[PDB]
Design a protein around this ligand. Structure first.
Ligand SMILES: *[C@H](C)[C@H]1/C(=C/c2[nH]c(/C=C3N=C(/C=C4\NC(=O)C(CC)=C4C)C(C)=C\3CCC(=O)O)c(CCC(=O)O)c2C)NC(=O)[C@@H]1C
Ligand SMILES: *[C@H](C)[C@H]1/C(=C/c2[nH]c(/C=C3N=C(/C=C4\NC(=O)C(CC)=C4C)C(C)=C\3CCC(=O)O)c(CCC(=O)O)c2C)NC(=O)[C@@H]1C
Ligand SMILES: *[C@H](C)[C@H]1/C(=C/c2[nH]c(/C=C3N=C(/C=C4\NC(=O)C(CC)=C4C)C(C)=C\3CCC(=O)O)c(CCC(=O)O)c2C)NC(=O)[C@@H]1C
Ligand SMILES: *[C@H](C)[C@H]1/C(=C/c2[nH]c(/C=C3N=C(/C=C4\NC(=O)C(CC)=C4C)C(C)=C\3CCC(=O)O)c(CCC(=O)O)c2C)NC(=O)[C@@H]1C
Ligand SMILES: *[C@H](C)[C@H]1/C(=C/c2[nH]c(/C=C3N=C(/C=C4\NC(=O)C(CC)=C4C)C(C)=C\3CCC(=O)O)c(CCC(=O)O)c2C)NC(=O)[C@@H]1C
Ligand SMILES: *[C@H](C)[C@H]1/C(=C/c2[nH]c(/C=C3N=C(/C=C4\NC(=O)C(CC)=C4C)C(C)=C\3CCC(=O)O)c(CCC(=O)O)c2C)NC(=O)[C@@H]1C
Ligand SMILES: *[C@H](C)[C@H]1/C(=C/c2[nH]c(/C=C3N=C(/C=C4\NC(=O)C(CC)=C4C)C(C)=C\3CCC(=O)O)c(CCC(=O)O)c2C)NC(=O)[C@@H]1C
Ligand SMILES: *[C@H](C)[C@H]1/C(=C/c2[nH]c(/C=C3N=C(/C=C4\NC(=O)C(CC)=C4C)C(C)=C\3CCC(=O)O)c(CCC(=O)O)c2C)NC(=O)[C@@H]1C
Ligand SMILES: *[C@H](C)[C@H]1/C(=C/c2[nH]c(/C=C3N=C(/C=C4\NC(=O)C(CC)=C4C)C(C)=C\3CCC(=O)O)c(CCC(=O)O)c2C)NC(=O)[C@@H]1C
Ligand SMILES: *[C@H](C)[C@H]1/C(=C/c2[nH]c(/C=C3N=C(/C=C4\NC(=O)C(CC)=C4C)C(C)=C\3CCC(=O)O)c(CCC(=O)O)c2C)NC(=O)[C@@H]1C
Ligand SMILES: *[C@H](C)[C@H]1/C(=C/c2[nH]c(/C=C3N=C(/C=C4\NC(=O)C(CC)=C4C)C(C)=C\3CCC(=O)O)c(CCC(=O)O)c2C)NC(=O)[C@@H]1C
Lengths: 73, 172, 162, 273, 162, 172, 172, 162, 162
């Protein structure tokens, strides 16, 4: 997701993170086995350095792995 | 408590005004029906015992478990209560019918009845059922008397219904 | 609120008993009366204003000094109040006629009457005149039972005030 | 307790009064020092309006003290209907959402995140809304922004206690109510060192958030239906935290922000700390 | 004894107040009704006997076994009593019509009814039939309001018995 | 949620029975009125804005103090709320009218409403008043429309009333 | 109950100690003021009726609506209550003033007051207002009496204020 | 807690009336006396310790056997307690002087005195001696009204104990 | 009758306890005050008459219309009564000073005040002026505590009347 402007209000250096998505990370609210969205198997988000460690750890424990990290600017 | 007349007053009071002529005409006509109204009440009271007796029989024929050990109408002690309650509800309904207003029934009897029943483990549904059974029987009398001047009581009959139903609903 | 109908219900309710013939007889009494009562109310309601003017006025004739400066009757605010008040009395009376009991009167006017009047130094006397003057006027527009009813209620207040 | 009649036979609005009983107020007819029945430490009476003044003075002139007064009509009302929260409904914001769908989410989010509480035109956030619907922000991220926003802080966090704010938070971010005294304690400590932002972050970041409505689902009410690792009492606490539809979390009302869940009730579900 | 008049007095008395319009309305009701009530009583009083015979009789038809030896209906003493009793019921009813209230009924008949009946093993059922049979006959000699009144009171007992 | 049909079902279910023929005939009839029913709703929705606007004006002409400093409709912020509330109530009422059942109105809107108002210090009396003011205006439209086939809508009109009144009562 | 002396005691008790000499000197001086203290009280009690009467007039001149139909001070019955209440609060305040301690006031009087007012729908704001109106009038007398030895009562005057204010706050 | 001031408030409060002249007179009494009372307290507070030693001691002289092994007076723990206790009595007395009422005494010492003493087999007698011995010593350090006050309170306990 | 002394006895008596130091303190207060109180009474008693004349008079100045024919102030009988009445008020006040409590006032004057006044249409207002006028005069003959006392009691009535 290309940042239109600095997403976060609170300010630090921001880094774009592209992740391969497990069904768990974004389960659809559907009956049966939850499916992540087809259109994005690789969600990309913008994160502040402070949040970067929590975001990565949560991504890690869920199936999906970091495809790439890029500084948001 | 409250009734049709008093009510209209109170409304008028908050507006701070004399009664509207329109409003008088509600009361004027209400008076005219009195005689019918009265007979209706008289019919219930006259048949009271029966109404209940009847309803009960039917209630227990339907929900046989209530009267089996472990049910809520067993043993005698409980049964007695259940009968007593039915009656009360009836009494209040009649009162309302005379007043020409739900209030008396709701404030004295219905407000909190559900919760009581719940706490005890009385099945509210069955209670409601009973109330209806009563309703039908009661109307039966109201609507089919002998030696009264023949005429149309529908208006009253329906209002009666409503009262019964408010009861059924709030209990249920 | 005390009306015939409410009372019999109440009495029946206390004893825990169905409304039997006893009470209905009573009810029948009310509602029979209503026709007269209702008539009276229509009459008062219509002439309200005129009755009020006349009354307020009267009071001043009866108690000239009230209109002098430094008194209660003096300065418009007070006059306005004076009017308002009497209006009320009247209003309620009509109500009571229609309700078929003193109920409305008791709860609005009478309960707490004394203390209010004491704390604000309203002299019962005044009100009374107002009423009397009214009673006198009403004694023309009405007749027979309608009249009788009107009086009863008007008086009821006189007695409560005094 | 339940009150069985709203009004006395003579017309009169009944009022339930709750006091802490004192030995003087009621005592056993026993030899030795007078003792009130332990079960009635908090006694309740329903009194007509007329006797209310006398009743209360007497209570207070003894060592009694009044816990609260409440009109009998509000009391002896049905427990709120759970109809709308039994099955929440749920909103998904697809990618390539058309204009309307984005609007629906937004509305739904404001509803759940703020409680019934109304958000005025000036209060509403264009910027945050802007981001959603040209991509860039997840529903999850929008939700974070709302809880960061001053609007949120002014209602929930700046008026009430942090104790209250936590459960207030739980309900908005997770349908659940709080289970156990520990959760309340953890959040409080987080807030003291990390501050307000970190605490807000910890609910959205939590896996319970992720497991249900993880991304691109507006939060819904999980509580009122059976959840894993949820104390049974939590379900009861959900009835205290959530009062009817058209009942809100409002700083605005008299003594607006108080605790729906008594501290003792939390202790029952679990203790340890 | 509970009649309309006594009640309003009582209510007035409890509150500690003079009889105001409220109560008089009620009283008026009682008095206007009386004309019908009184008529009804004259009618019952006259046909008393015949009503009684008919009733007693009925009961036996309804419950044949009572007349068999070793039963309660059997042997004249019992029959005499049975007659006496019904007479009473009737007597009181008339009273109540005239008094304009259930009062007379309540105090003579109803209060203690159950226990008496229990201890002597009088089956309410019987009485009831008696009454019903009566009601049916009365439903010829009377008409309109007079009738209505008669019924009310007759029933009142049925309900008390049952 | 619930509506006329579903309701009857549920009742039938607890008895454990197929729907009584009598009961069908309630629903059968209900269907027939549909068209009328619909138009009624359509009339409200079409006039919504106005209904409110109107009622408000009248509300404030009567209770001047609400809009005076210290009153409950002052200042702007509060005023706004008061307007929106009125509207909501209306919205629900309409919904009910279509459903043929009070429920939706009771559950979403009326439940807890009194208490809210209380806690805020909003004067329940005035709220109720507003609701009535609305009622009358609304009926006005329901009952006097343009381009519609002429017939009798009374039945619907009364049911509408009731809904408004349930509201008035429970708020008050 | 409690008052200035008793209070100091109690504190001392929990420490488990005899009273500190310092602490005695609080009480010693408190005694010295007695006479002033008394006169203060005497002034209120002497003027009681008036204080209230006055405050009321002003209260109703400001908030006209209270006395209009639909308001909280209407009708007579209600008005009466409102007056009665004012007085009570005053009575307590005086008591406190004598005791030299808020407690009595808080425990007998203020405790539960807010909630009552709320439940009734009495507007707490207005109540508070009344209390202040009273305050000012009362001070008026305390501070301007007749036949009293001239001297400084400020200390007492302020304490008086505080009591009034505790009241205002807890009600509000 | 019962002091002069609290009582008059209470009495006023019960009847529902303002503090009038009656009560203030009473209050005034309390305040005038205080000067003497306060003096007494300063005197006891200062000599506390010495009074206590003397008392404890006395008790043992009076009841030699207490100090024998297997008795209550025997072994330091008990002696410590004995000291503590008397200290308390004294402490409270001072309090009461200052508070200007028995209140403090009643609530700490007196209420429940008996049962405590029964369950732990403390003989009232002992305490009493303690007090008496004290009273005697106090009867030197004080004089006039100050003295009188001291006595009153000391006694008050004697009577409660006995 | 409520005086300081009677009250403490009463309170003591209710609880079922001996008069302890608490109460005596209170009593002492009453006795110390007496000297001032007594002085005040001697002063009022002496000037009684003159105070009364002045008051009665005042009232008429304040309410001229009273002296007009057909009013209450008119015709000697009424004037005599008016005098008498005020005398009474005064008399009692003195009593209360001496008794050291409101008691005398409460039982003679205050209890039943309202109803008497209502039934005979005596306007509280009048009395009040009387008192006020008095208070003003007394405010010359007396000084210091004696004065203070006099006021207290005089006021006490003002408040009761209003
Ligand atoms: C009968 C149709 C059903 C039924 C009834 C039932 N009720 C109770 C117990 C109580 N009922 C009430 C309710 C009232 N008392 C009142 O005063 C009023 C009017 C305000 C009502 C309607 C109360 C007070 C009780 C509890 C105490 C009592 O027994 O009086 C029972 C007995 C329950 C028990 O645990 O003993 C029963 C059986 N339950 C059924 O089974 C029927 C479906
Ligand atoms: C209606 C449910 C059924 C019905 C009623 C009905 N009644 C009347 C007329 C009267 N009924 C009464 C009855 C009373 N008046 C009283 O004062 C009392 C209490 C003491 C009663 C019970 C009276 C007196 C009248 C007036 C004329 C008469 O002789 O009955 C009517 C006729 C219409 C009217 O209002 O007059 C009707 C229709 N009969 C029915 O057809 C319904 C089934
Ligand atoms: C008319 C004869 C005199 C007069 C009257 C007057 N009244 C007031 C003030 C009040 N009047 C009432 C009376 C009522 N208010 C109610 O709610 C009811 C019951 C429905 C009544 C009968 C009240 C309560 C007041 C107190 C304050 C208020 O206005 O509400 C005044 C003002 C006196 C003052 O200083 O407060 C006056 C003057 N006006 C005249 O000129 C006549 C002498
Ligand atoms: C003693 C081992 C511990 C202790 C006890 C204690 N209790 C109180 C006060 C109360 N205790 C009770 C207990 C009961 N009341 C009952 O009716 C029953 C049986 C049916 C019980 C067991 C109650 C109700 C009270 C409060 C009111 C009363 O006095 O009756 C105290 C005093 C508390 C106070 O401040 O008043 C104490 C000390 N506490 C200890 O210190 C011990 C560890
Ligand atoms: C207008 C007729 C009257 C009025 C209304 C008023 N309401 C509020 C505040 C709220 N009212 C509600 C109402 C609802 N919540 C719901 O969800 C529904 C049904 C779904 C309704 C109808 C709520 C939630 C609030 C609280 C939230 C908020 O206030 O933002 C106020 C404002 C209270 C304040 O002090 O700010 C007002 C004024 N009050 C009047 O004056 C009229 C009589
Ligand atoms: C008639 C339907 C049946 C019948 C009746 C019968 N009754 C008794 C005995 C009593 N019956 C009454 C009734 C009343 N006595 C009163 O004082 C009143 C109130 C005014 C009533 C209603 C009473 C009290 C008695 C008991 C005392 C007595 O001896 O009368 C009997 C005799 C029972 C016995 O055990 O001897 C009988 C048989 N007889 C029939 O044939 C019918 C079956
Ligand atoms: C009743 C409040 C007033 C009124 C209404 C009325 N409408 C009809 C008939 C129809 N009205 C509609 C309208 C709709 N049907 C729909 O499906 C929709 C939503 C898409 C609408 C708005 C229709 C289609 C009909 C049937 C065709 C026709 O118009 O004739 C009637 C006639 C009764 C009947 O159809 O059975 C009436 C009375 N007219 C009034 O006079 C009332 C004031
Ligand atoms: C007057 C300034 C305002 C006002 C007062 C008001 N109060 C009531 C009713 C009650 N007020 C109280 C007061 C107390 N309860 C207590 O415990 C204490 C302290 C010890 C007080 C002072 C109580 C108990 C009641 C309810 C019972 C009663 O009859 O008094 C009302 C009447 C409410 C009603 O609906 O009847 C009023 C009007 N309200 C105003 O309008 C003023 C702003
Ligand atoms: C303070 C608000 C005003 C003020 C007070 C003031 N009073 C005194 C002195 C005394 N006041 C009293 C009054 C009483 N003593 C009692 O025992 C009783 C109850 C029966 C009362 C009412 C007394 C006796 C005294 C002592 C003698 C005297 O009057 O002088 C003073 C003087 C200083 C002092 O503390 O003694 C003062 C200042 N004077 C003001 O200026 C304030 C307006
Ligand atoms: C001294 C004259 C004798 C003596 C006394 C002694 N006392 C105890 C134990 C207790 N003494 C008290 C007394 C009080 N405790 C209080 O809280 C108060 C109110 C302030 C008093 C007066 C109490 C309650 C105890 C019981 C337990 C405790 O720990 O206090 C003992 C110990 C006896 C025992 O059975 O434990 C003794 C011996 N000691 C002497 O040498 C004298 C004969
Ligand atoms: C004086 C200000 C006005 C006045 C007074 C006046 N009073 C009466 C009649 C009575 N006055 C009282 C008062 C008292 N009687 C007592 O026993 C006591 C307590 C010791 C008091 C205060 C009473 C009881 C009466 C009524 C019976 C009686 O005759 O004494 C009148 C006569 C009024 C009448 O007869 O209706 C008058 C005129 N007269 C004036 O000139 C002033 C206006």
């Amino acid at each position: 997701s290309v940042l239109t402007g600095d997403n976060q209000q609170r300010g630090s250096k921001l880094f774009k993170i592209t992740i391969a998505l497990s069904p768990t990370l974004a389960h659809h609210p559907w009956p049966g086995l939850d499916t992540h969205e087809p259109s994005q198997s690789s969600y990309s988000t913008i994160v502040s350095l402070e949040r970067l460690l929590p975001e990565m750890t949560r991504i890690k424990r869920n199936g999906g792995r970091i495809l790439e990290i890029t500084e948001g600017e | 408590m409250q009734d049709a007349f008093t009510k209209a007053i109170v409304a008028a009071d908050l507006r701070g005004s004399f009664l509207s002529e329109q409003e008088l005409n509600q009361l004027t006509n209400l008076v005219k029906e009195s005689n019918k109204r009265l007979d209706a009440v008289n019919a219930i009271t006259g048949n009271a015992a029966e109404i209940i007796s009847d309803a009960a029989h039917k209630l227990f024929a339907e929900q046989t478990d209530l009267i089996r050990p472990g049910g809520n109408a067993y043993p005698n002690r409980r049964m007695a209560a259940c009968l007593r309650d039915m009656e009360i509800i009836l009494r209040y309904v009649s009162y309302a019918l005379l007043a020409g207003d739900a209030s008396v029934l709701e404030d004295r009897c219905l407000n909190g009845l559900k919760e009581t029943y719940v706490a005890l483990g009385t099945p509210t549904r069955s209670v409601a059922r009973a109330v209806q059974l009563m309703k039908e029987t009661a109307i039966g009398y109201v609507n089919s008397p002998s030696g009264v001047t023949r005429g149309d009581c529908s208006a009253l009959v329906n209002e009666a219904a409503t009262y019964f139903d408010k009861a059924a609903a709030s209990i249920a | 609120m005390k009306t015939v109908i409410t009372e019999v219900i109440a009495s029946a309710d206390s004893q825990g008993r169905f409304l039997n013939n006893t009470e209905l007889q009573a009810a029948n009494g009310r509602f029979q009366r209503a026709t007269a009562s209702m008539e009276a109310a229509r009459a008062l309601t219509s002439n309200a204003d005129s009755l009020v003017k006349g009354a307020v006025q009267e009071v001043y004739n009866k108690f000239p000094y009230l209109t002098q400066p430094g008194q209660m009757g003096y300065g418009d605010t007070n006059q306005a109040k004076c009017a308002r008040d009497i209006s009320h009395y009247l209003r309620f009376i009509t109500y009571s006629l229609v309700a078929g009991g003193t109920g409305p009167l008791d709860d609005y006017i009478v309960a707490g009457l004394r203390e209010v009047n004491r704390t604000f130094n309203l002299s019962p006397s005044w009100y009374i005149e107002a009423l009397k003057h009214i009673k006198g006027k009403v004694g023309s527009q009405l007749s027979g039972q309608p009249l009788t009813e009107a009086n009863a209620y008007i008086d009821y207040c006189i007695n409560a005030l005094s | 307790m339940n009150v069985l009649t709203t009004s006395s036979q003579r017309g009169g609005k009944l009022f339930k009064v709750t006091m802490t009983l004192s030995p003087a107020l009621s005592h056993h007819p026993w030899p030795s020092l007078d003792t009130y029945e332990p079960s009635q430490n908090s006694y309740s009476v329903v009194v007509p309006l007329d006797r209310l003044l006398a009743e209360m003075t007497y209570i207070k002139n003894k060592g009694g003290r009044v816990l609260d007064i409440s009109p009998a009509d509000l009391e002896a009302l049905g427990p709120p209907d759970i109809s709308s929260v039994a099955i929440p409904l749920k909103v998904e914001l697809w990618a390539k959402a058309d204009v309307s769908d984005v609007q629906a989410a937004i509305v739904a989010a404001y509803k759940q995140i703020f409680g019934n509480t109304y958000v005025l035109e000036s209060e509403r956030l264009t910027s945050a809304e802007s981001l959603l619907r040209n991509g860039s922000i997840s529903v999850r991220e929008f939700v974070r922004l709302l809880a960061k926003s001053e609007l949120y802080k002014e209602r929930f966090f700046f008026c009430t206690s942090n104790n209250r704010f936590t459960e207030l938070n739980f309900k908005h971010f997770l349908g659940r109510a709080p289970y156990n005294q520990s959760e309340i304690a953890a959040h409080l400590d987080r807030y003291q060192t990390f501050g307000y932002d970190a605490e807000i972050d910890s609910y959205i970041d939590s896996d319970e958030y992720i497991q249900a409505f993880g991304e691109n689902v507006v939060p819904y009410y999980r509580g009122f239906k059976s959840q894993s690792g949820q104390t049974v009492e939590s379900f009861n606490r959900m009835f205290k935290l959530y009062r009817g539809d058209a009942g809100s979390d409002t700083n605005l009302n008299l003594q607006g922000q108080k605790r729906r869940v008594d501290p003792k009730n939390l202790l029952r579900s679990g203790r340890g700390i």
